[PDB]
Write an enzyme that holds these catalytic residues in place. Sequence first.
Site, short mmCIF file in Angstrom:
data_model
loop_
_atom_site.label_atom_id
_atom_site.label_comp_id
_atom_site.label_asym_id
_atom_site.label_seq_id
_atom_site.Cartn_x
_atom_site.Cartn_y
_atom_site.Cartn_z
N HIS A 13 6.05 -21.29 162.19
CA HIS A 13 6.09 -22.20 161.05
C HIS A 13 7.32 -23.12 160.95
O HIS A 13 8.43 -22.67 160.72
CB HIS A 13 6.13 -21.49 159.72
CG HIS A 13 4.84 -20.88 159.32
ND1 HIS A 13 4.22 -21.28 158.20
CD2 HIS A 13 4.16 -19.78 159.85
CE1 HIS A 13 3.20 -20.42 158.01
NE2 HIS A 13 3.13 -19.50 159.01
N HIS A 16 -3.69 -17.18 156.43
CA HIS A 16 -3.00 -15.90 156.22
C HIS A 16 -3.91 -14.83 155.63
O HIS A 16 -4.38 -14.98 154.52
CB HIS A 16 -1.77 -16.07 155.35
CG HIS A 16 -0.65 -16.88 155.99
ND1 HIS A 16 0.44 -16.37 156.59
CD2 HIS A 16 -0.52 -18.28 156.00
CE1 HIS A 16 1.25 -17.41 156.95
NE2 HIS A 16 0.66 -18.62 156.59
N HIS A 47 2.22 -26.53 160.35
CA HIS A 47 2.54 -27.77 159.63
C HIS A 47 3.28 -28.82 160.47
O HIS A 47 2.73 -29.80 160.93
CB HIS A 47 3.28 -27.52 158.30
CG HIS A 47 2.70 -26.36 157.54
ND1 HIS A 47 1.61 -26.42 156.77
CD2 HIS A 47 3.16 -25.03 157.56
CE1 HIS A 47 1.36 -25.16 156.31
NE2 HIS A 47 2.31 -24.30 156.80
N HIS A 96 -4.91 -21.08 161.56
CA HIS A 96 -3.71 -20.75 160.73
C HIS A 96 -3.99 -20.20 159.30
O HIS A 96 -3.66 -20.81 158.28
CB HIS A 96 -2.77 -21.97 160.68
CG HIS A 96 -1.47 -21.80 159.92
ND1 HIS A 96 -0.32 -22.22 160.39
CD2 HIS A 96 -1.17 -21.30 158.65
CE1 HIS A 96 0.64 -22.01 159.46
NE2 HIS A 96 0.13 -21.42 158.34
N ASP A 128 -5.03 -22.15 155.18
CA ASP A 128 -3.74 -21.49 154.93
C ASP A 128 -3.74 -20.27 153.97
O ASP A 128 -3.49 -19.13 154.36
CB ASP A 128 -2.66 -22.55 154.61
CG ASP A 128 -1.27 -21.97 154.62
OD1 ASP A 128 -0.58 -22.11 153.62
OD2 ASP A 128 -0.87 -21.40 155.62
N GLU A 156 7.36 -27.64 157.49
CA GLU A 156 6.69 -27.76 156.17
C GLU A 156 7.60 -28.26 155.02
O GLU A 156 7.31 -29.23 154.36
CB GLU A 156 6.05 -26.42 155.79
CG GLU A 156 5.23 -26.35 154.48
CD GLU A 156 4.65 -24.96 154.24
OE1 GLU A 156 5.33 -23.97 154.52
OE2 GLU A 156 3.54 -24.88 153.73
C1 LIG Z 1 3.38 -14.11 156.36
C2 LIG Z 1 2.42 -13.52 155.29
O1 LIG Z 1 1.04 -13.65 155.79
C3 LIG Z 1 2.75 -13.91 153.78
C4 LIG Z 1 4.21 -13.66 153.35
C5 LIG Z 1 4.48 -13.58 151.82
C6 LIG Z 1 5.97 -13.35 151.58
C7 LIG Z 1 6.46 -12.04 151.44
C8 LIG Z 1 7.83 -11.78 151.39
C9 LIG Z 1 8.74 -12.82 151.58
C10 LIG Z 1 8.27 -14.13 151.73
C11 LIG Z 1 9.23 -15.16 151.80
C12 LIG Z 1 8.80 -16.48 151.89
C13 LIG Z 1 7.43 -16.79 151.86
C14 LIG Z 1 6.48 -15.76 151.80
C15 LIG Z 1 6.90 -14.40 151.76
N1 LIG Z 1 2.32 -15.26 153.42
C16 LIG Z 1 1.15 -15.58 152.87
N2 LIG Z 1 0.97 -16.91 152.84
C17 LIG Z 1 2.26 -17.51 153.27
C18 LIG Z 1 2.53 -18.98 153.26
N3 LIG Z 1 1.79 -19.71 152.47
O2 LIG Z 1 3.33 -19.54 154.00
C19 LIG Z 1 3.08 -16.51 153.62
ZN LIG Z 2 0.94 -20.60 156.65
#
Ligand SMILES: C[C@H](O)[C@@H](CCc1cccc2ccccc12)n1cnc(C(N)=O)c1
Ligand SMILES: [Zn+2]
Length: 349
Positions: free
Chosen positions: A211, A14, A235, A12, A292, A214
């Site tokens: 997801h 990103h 999560h 998991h 993550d 969380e």
């Molecule tokens: C999936 C992808 O790999 C991106 C998305 C980043 C993003 C862009 C636009 C809108 C969003 C709205 C909510 C959260 C992240 C968002 N991303 C990176 N890490 C997470 C996380 N920690 O859950 C989400």
């Molecule tokens: Zn994630």
Amino acid sequence: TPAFDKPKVELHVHLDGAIKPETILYYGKRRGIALPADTPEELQNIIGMDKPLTLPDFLAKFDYYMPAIAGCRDAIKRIAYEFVEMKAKDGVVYVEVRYSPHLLANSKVEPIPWNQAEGDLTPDEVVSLVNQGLQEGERDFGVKVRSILCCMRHQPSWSSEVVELCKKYREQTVVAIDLAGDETIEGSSLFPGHVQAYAEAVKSGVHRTVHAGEVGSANVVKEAVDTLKTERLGHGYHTLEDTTLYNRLRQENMHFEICPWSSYLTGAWKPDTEHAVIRFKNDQVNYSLNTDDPLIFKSTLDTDYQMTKKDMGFTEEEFKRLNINAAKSSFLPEDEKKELLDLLYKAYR
Ligand SMILES: C[C@H](O)[C@@H](CCc1cccc2ccccc12)n1cnc(C(N)=O)c1
Ligand SMILES: [Zn+2]
């Protein structure tokens, strides 16, 4: 220093949150984007959390670096490639990695993300750039990599093109679907685009992970199992607030996508509670450890295995069992799975 040096599996991570600082400034300047700083060690410091934040604050980190990579083909290529190498450095024998291909595109994507106006880079060649990078990353580094594509909660429109990309670039290297973004947007698991997406996914055999739990409730979890038909759970901390749902998920081996360092820094974990992971070692369920976002949480897998190691009493015998669990629950075809299995037992012996 390692908390566990045997090989490990991770399921998991990103992609767009495991870019290297050095690399982002390289691109921000070689494209003229350029950004809040210029020495790597101080840029890592402004993109990186140490303390829980709000959703806009959080979201905003993405705002600084992303425009430096989306749009550029060899920014895409180099990030998947350099991802594999970080995971080689990290003890990992098998990683799955996810992104949204829309979020790196600048053509054929309403709306255009991160304020970019237009180029010619679509979602379609973003996958394939990414996966080219992952293949010669795999080959040069000896880490078996696969990829998950993520639907975004706030953008159901994009979802039929996700299932479709998954089908297309199947094997080479994509093996599953995700649902990411904020699980808190009301009714979001039930948006008709997301659900027809997951249904095409069971129609054509694409693996699924959502997801859920969380920051949202046990009902987003429930939504994800009974409606979106997930095979695993990012999560899932909040299924613990519903004990029949928890108990039934133990009974059918849910795989849970745990990310314990990540969860102090987000807020999903209040430090004065049980960490959900510990109830998870006590009840012997099917779960992994997971990083993550290295770039934003200022971490690697060792930060996760350290943190569990000394704050939560875990031992090397649970650290193995969790990696094997991971391998079993990975989205590999069962032939390649039994081979990943073999390497792991051997290594652990
Ligand atoms: C999936 C992808 O790999 C991106 C998305 C980043 C993003 C862009 C636009 C809108 C969003 C709205 C909510 C959260 C992240 C968002 N991303 C990176 N890490 C997470 C996380 N920690 O859950 C989400
Ligand atoms: Zn994630």
